[PDB]
Design a protein around this ligand. Structure first.
Ligand SMILES: Cc1cn([C@H]2C[C@H](OP(=O)(O)O)[C@@H](COP(=O)(O)O)O2)c(=O)[nH]c1=O
Ligand SMILES: [Ca+2]
Length: 132
């Protein structure tokens, strides 16, 4: 896997964002996680997850996207990646706070699954947010 740059245009919710990627605006969706819903007809921790994601990506010097080994987009045309803000994976950061659950684990895009599950298990043991 490799990391590629991208530019933040807008944070949408806990797990979806608009990026300028190779000079074209594109929606991206975090791999392997689900933040609580705030759009579709509001789940507990949805606004909290959304705020955490927004703050982490808005404050970054450098944003990178890392595709996994399979599909790079989902059926809605969203890019599927691990997103890094100054080298810190946002997917893991949300899970580690109990603001997302490991979810949507679709092979072959499961490279960081165990890493994320370990963070989830720590958030759960610490009784954080969704696990509280
Ligand atoms: C994270 C992810 C979501 N999806 C799809 C599954 C869900 O489709 P359906 O909407 O048809 O259920 C939706 C979950 O995204 P959201 O959590 O943004 O709604 O996006 C993928 O196909 N691949 C992925 O890797
Ligand atoms: Ca979601």
């Amino acid at each position: 896997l490799h990391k590629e740059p991208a530019t933040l245009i807008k944070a949408i919710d806990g797990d979806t964002m608009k990026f300028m990627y190779k000079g074209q605006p594109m929606t991206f969706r975090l791999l392997l996680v689900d933040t609580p819903e705030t759009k579709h007809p509001v789940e507990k921790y949805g606004p909290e997850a959304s705020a955490f994601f927004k703050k982490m990506v808005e404050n970054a010097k450098k944003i990178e996207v890392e595709f996994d080994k399979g599909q790079r987009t989902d059926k809605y045309g969203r890019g599927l990646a691990y997103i890094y803000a100054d080298g810190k994976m946002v997917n893991e950061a949300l899970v580690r706070q109990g603001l997302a659950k490991v979810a949507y684990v679709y092979k072959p895009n499961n490279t960081h699954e165990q890493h994320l599950r370990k963070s989830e298990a720590q958030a759960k043991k610490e009784k954080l947010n969704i696990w509280s």
